[PDB]
């Protein structure tokens, strides 16, 4: 029938900007520049963004708007054979909501811990410390910074877990933290995009205020120029390496967030004739611009540390949670007005992650609401139920061995799941559905057909770009390990279910529906390859 639409155009954009701008923007991108060729990394990064990244991002938004339905239904109406794709994508988003919100919880945890004259992670003399603790980061693994032990031996208590097999006690400060996260998500996603679309105003915009303050604070710091030097100093030697092109391609793909049905779902609330193509480019750019800016926020502080604090740069320049919960707060505590930098820093983290979590959850609620009217009829129940399921299982993430759980999901929730899922999205759209049909759909919406540029990216470049990621990442495969702990064979295989459970939906739904329709093989292919709007 007629679905609701965004209260206003900025509600959509801030929702998409919000979903896309994420912790990866902060902890992975600047590190990738530093790691490969400095400023030169922007060359392979930019090309990968142009040919691979945005075309996928653009695709998902266009489809979501035009078919005016969530992921399950939309792919049902597009290529019924491949309706499984919709299932896969929605399923992947599902698994991720389990481990991802614990990041926001850690953020809230450090925020609550940040009200004080003296930040707890500064020194080495606390009860949780070990004799091997030192004040700042080093390159010897047995000896950890005072900030690393705070996070590890106090906040996480990971030192008390012998592996994933041993989870240990439930930390109720984290259990409480995780709850507050889902409470915030609840009364955000509660009534749908009417309220949700407003909430993103704070959670999308806040990080930029806090990036601004910390960008100034960081640049006014002694040594801050040395940092920018480490961040952006060109070396084009790196550009010649395959590893660099894989890192660029890979960061770009996971940054713009295709494959969760979130872009799809969000756009489905757009007015049919609005210019999505303008939106995809504006949203894309704001996403990468944010990562670029963020790099300065980090490495300015990173330089301050290498200058006044006497640490080797390679020791403090790192990716993932370590940068944000260990390295950066270490610098913050050394500077004047530390408590203020801490509070706004951690709030920025939480508000960086919440928009993302919102969008992912919405990809589910929307996708199911469009398939099962019973769900559509009562939203408040469904999401209360869903988040309750998230909370309960997520307590595994608040145990003492919880990180081991978090890390496991992080790898297998979708690494390869989302890569194939998008690979079928592209192949289905470009070949089975046809590009000329997609293009004709877009011209009807915007007024003009996509250039032959996008059509070549959708039909050829992207899929190649996609398996370029997977192949060069497959050959580099190594069994799951975190920090001298080697995950057991069984836990590894437990992950591959989680990985494969979504992707099988594609051939599984194809198999089921191919055998649920009559006629010959040739004529039941044509039945399942004919789109909903053609009938």
């Amino acid at each position: 029938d007629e679905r609701e639409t965004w209260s206003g155009k900025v509600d959509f954009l801030l929702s998409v900007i919000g979903f896309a701008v994420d912790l990866a923007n902060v902890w992975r991108f600047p590190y990738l520049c530093y790691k490969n060729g400095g400023g030169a990394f922007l060359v392979p990064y930019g090309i990968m963004l142009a040919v691979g990244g945005i075309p996928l991002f653009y695709m998902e938004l266009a489809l979501g708007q035009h078919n005016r339905k969530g992921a399950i239904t939309c792919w049902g109406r597009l290529v019924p054979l491949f309706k499984g794709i919709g299932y896969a994508v929605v399923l992947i988003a599902f698994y991720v909501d389990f481990y991802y919100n614990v990041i926001i919880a850690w953020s809230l945890r450090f925020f609550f811990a940040s009200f004080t004259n003296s930040l707890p992670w500064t020194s080495c003399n606390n009860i949780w410390n070990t004799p091997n603790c030192r004040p700042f980061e080093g390159h010897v693994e047995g000896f950890q910074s005072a900030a690393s032990e705070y996070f590890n031996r106090y906040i996480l208590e990971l030192n008390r877990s012998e592996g994933i097999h041993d989870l240990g006690a439930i930390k109720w400060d984290m259990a409480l933290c995780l709850l507050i996260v889902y409470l915030i998500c609840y009364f955000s996603l509660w009534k749908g995009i009417s309220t949700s679309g407003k909430v993103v105003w704070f959670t999308a915009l806040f990080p930029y205020a806090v990036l601004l303050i910390l960008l100034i604070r960081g640049l006014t710091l002694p040594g801050s120029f040395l940092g920018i030097q480490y961040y952006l100093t060109p070396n084009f030697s790196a550009i010649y390496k395959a590893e660099v092109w894989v890192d660029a391609a890979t960061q770009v793909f996971f940054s713009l967030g295709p494959g969760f049905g979130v872009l799809l779902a969000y756009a489905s609330y757009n007015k049919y004739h609005n210019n999505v193509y303008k939106d995809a480019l504006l949203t894309s750019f704001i996403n990468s611009a944010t990562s670029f800016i963020a790099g300065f926020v980090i490495f300015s502080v990173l330089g301050y540390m290498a200058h006044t604090l006497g640490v080797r740069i390679e020791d403090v320049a790192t990716e993932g949670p370590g940068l944000v919960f260990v390295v950066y707060p270490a610098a913050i505590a050394t500077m004047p007005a530390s408590t203020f930098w801490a509070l706004i820093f951690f709030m920025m983290l939480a508000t960086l992650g919440l928009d993302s979590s919102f969008g992912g959850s919405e990809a589910i609620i929307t996708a199911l609401s469009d398939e099962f009217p019973k769900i559509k009829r009562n939203r408040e129940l469904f999401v209360a139920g869903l988040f309750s399921l998230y909370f309960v299982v997520g307590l595994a993430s608040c145990t003492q061995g919880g990180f081991y759980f978090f890390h496991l999901l992080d790898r297998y929730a979708a690494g390869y799941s989302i890569l194939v899922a998008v690979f079928f999205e592209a192949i289905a759209v470009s070949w089975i559905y046809g590009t000329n049909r997609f293009s004709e759909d877009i011209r009807d919406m915007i007024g003009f057909p996509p250039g032959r540029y996008w059509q070549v990216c959708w039909r050829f470049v992207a899929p190649i770009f996609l398996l370029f990621i997977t192949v060069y990442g497959l050959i580099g495969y190594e069994p799951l390990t975190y920090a001298d702990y080697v995950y057991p064979s069984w836990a590894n295989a437990l992950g591959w279910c989680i990985a494969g459970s979504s992707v099988v939906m594609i051939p599984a739904v194809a198999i089921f529906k191919l055998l649920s329709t009559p006629g010959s093989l040739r004529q039941r292919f044509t039945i399942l390859t004919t789109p909903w709007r053609d009938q």
Partner: antibody
Amino acid sequence: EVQLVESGGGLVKPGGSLKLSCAASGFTFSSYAMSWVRQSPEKRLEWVAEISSGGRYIYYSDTVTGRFTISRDNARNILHLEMSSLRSEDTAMYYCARGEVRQRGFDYWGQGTTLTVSS
Amino acid sequence: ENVLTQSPAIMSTSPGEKVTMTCRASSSVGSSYLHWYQQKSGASPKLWIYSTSNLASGVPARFSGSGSGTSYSLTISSVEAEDAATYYCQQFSGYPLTFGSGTKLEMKR
């Protein structure tokens, strides 16, 4: 290079029906939405119907809606307008016009073909 | 329908003089969807200006166009007798598509 040629059309009794064709050449005809624009003897330009590249999207003016049917042959590169229960007010020269990008308007027009509706 | 009215209906001009014609829509039109056609006597229309300011292929630089919302105009800076024709404006903004009432440019002598 790009040529558009309308044909069909002539005298028809009121209430009758008739079928116009536009022969396209000089470009991939499948890549372009087309429209029929007509000009009355009083020289008023009026748009009639538009058909997409793959002819999955079709728009009509209110004046001709339900009597006229626009169609497309992408193999033979032809454009069609099938008119029924014609009225005197449908008298006009009929123009086959090509435009795909709305922001660019109609970038090529045919010579036209004349339809006269009189008892 | 969005009705586009043009003025004047007819106008005469001596070559070299500057001519201006206006187009007024009953409802607002995005400047990207407003176009202009020149039709010479006894021949078929030709796309002249598109997206309100843009000259089509083959259009002399002495032509220009401007406007927004409900009011647009086509302008010939220095007229040539070659320019005597009827000018139509069109909006591709919404269906049904509509052409303005036209302006007949005739030469003065």
